[PDB]
Write a protein that binds this ligand. Sequence first.
Ligand SMILES: [Zn+2]
Length: 107
Amino acid sequence: TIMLRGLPTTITESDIREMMESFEGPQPADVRLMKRKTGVSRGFAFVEFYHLQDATSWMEANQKKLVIQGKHIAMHYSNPRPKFEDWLCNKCGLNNFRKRLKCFRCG
Ligand SMILES: [Zn+2]
């Protein structure tokens, strides 16, 4: 899970994956361009991985090497930022909300 920010308001989830079949590191598992309620993508997008060596090598050599729409974008770690009454999942280790009973990785 690595986030990249600043994707324009007309970019398809494919538009980032049309040129991300060629960067370094072994091929990933899942890519999620964050959506909204009306059906728009607000600037940020997460990348999951099969392995951790692959993500490490991805951020290793080309952190500040990815240009689309004439603007560089950072590729930064993703660590949860919780609140007071937040729980944990015993099969994914993913932090999720309190008024919801299901995790966002397996359920
Ligand atoms: Zn989980």
